[PDB]
């Protein structure tokens, strides 16, 4: 309808955070989303999200995780919406047989993070609702916890809008026109121009980045979570049951304690169906794996939470080949910033990424080390049409 300093396409986890950072600096910003964030068609719903600090996936991750934590605490003080609860996060697995646990312990050591190390019966004794074999070891992070993701996006949106940011909802971006001095987006509701463009369309990045002459392999996955009736005297946040992410023989699982009797929430991380974001079946239970994969874990490790399925949710992961993020400037256009391939573990960093995206869009650089997320890295297999 007119000109803006910056346009953000995809106002979800990353986009809304970037929008808040931009608006706070007085930048005329327009955020465009295919739906009305927060919504249940992308990758940010399901009430809760785990944030961990002892990130062994990469050292560059820890600093970003710590900065994000501080930013989440800042957001908590600015809005009336609930943002974070310090449940702590438990990580366990078979001794000497889990690379996830090992790297977590290494990360904790290298960055001097505060953690408790326990093994075997010690785990079961500290948290009654958990039953693990004696050959299992664990690392507990008391200072990390759970974020209320929908509240996070809602808060960033309200704060951004109060400062002048415009949010155009139910508007799908269909094409881009990039020039060395400006950008333009085309939608069924009209075309818009700006000096800078931030692209953060989540799972849809796999289908539309080609419009920006980018040929990066991105694979969307259907990932479900289930809420189970549980023994509240053992799995409630009120009795200090922690959030968790563990590695067992058949893969990685993550879960949350019951909040206000909502029940324990569990998800299987290593498996999901390869899908197209436009034809994905968003109904939980249509595949036998949806529920069976979850109960298999519960009856073995948390029997007291293997109750009636209270509710399920379908959501998406967007993976890169190396499972590391993509946060960088378009290789050919310095006025286009790309945020994609969060591979199922990016929400906890959304506050920090919002800061990174705003810095890149306004100055072409950022104070954070984002070298591991380069769009030019080999393992990615990036090319142009
Ligand atoms: C799915 C999932 C993910 C997940 C998780 C549990 C489940 C079931 N648990 C996590 C956890 O405990 N800790 C953590 O750190 N991450 C966890 N995740 C992953 C995290 O949720 C995702 O990495 C994150 O949400 C990715 O954010 P991103 O911003 O990429 O994705 P989005 O929030 O879906 O936003 C994309 C938005 O863009 C819009 N869109 C799409 N296409 C268009 C077009 N054409 N035009 C305009 N807007 C568009 C969408 O509407 C969406 O809002
Ligand atoms: Cl993702």
From Swiss-Prot:
Family matches, as Gene3D superfamilies:
D-Amino Acid Oxidase, subunit A, domain 2, FAD/NAD(P)-binding domain
Q: Record's InterPro entries?
A: FAD-dep_OxRdtase (IPR006076), FAD/NAD-bd_sf (IPR036188), MTOX (IPR045170), SoxA_mon (IPR006281)
The name of this protein is Monomeric sarcosine oxidase
Family under the similarity heading: Belongs to the MSOX/MTOX family. MSOX subfamily.
User: Gene of origin?
Assistant: soxA
User: Which Pfam families does this chain map to?
Assistant: DAO
Provide the primary localization: cytoplasm
Q: Where does FAD bind?
A: 5-35
> Which reaction(s) does the protein catalyse, per the Swiss-Prot or TrEMBL entry?
sarcosine + O2 + H2O = formaldehyde + glycine + H2O2
Alphabetical keyword list? Cytoplasm, FAD, Flavoprotein, Oxidoreductase
Activity control summary: Pyrrole-2-carboxylate is a competitive inhibitor. N-(cyclopropyl)glycine (CPG) is a mechanism-based inhibitor and inactivates the enzyme by covalently modifying the flavin.
Q: Would I find Iron among this entry's keywords?
A: no
Identify residues that carry S-8alpha-FAD cysteine.
315
Per the UniProt entry, the Enzyme Commission number(s) are: 1.5.3.1
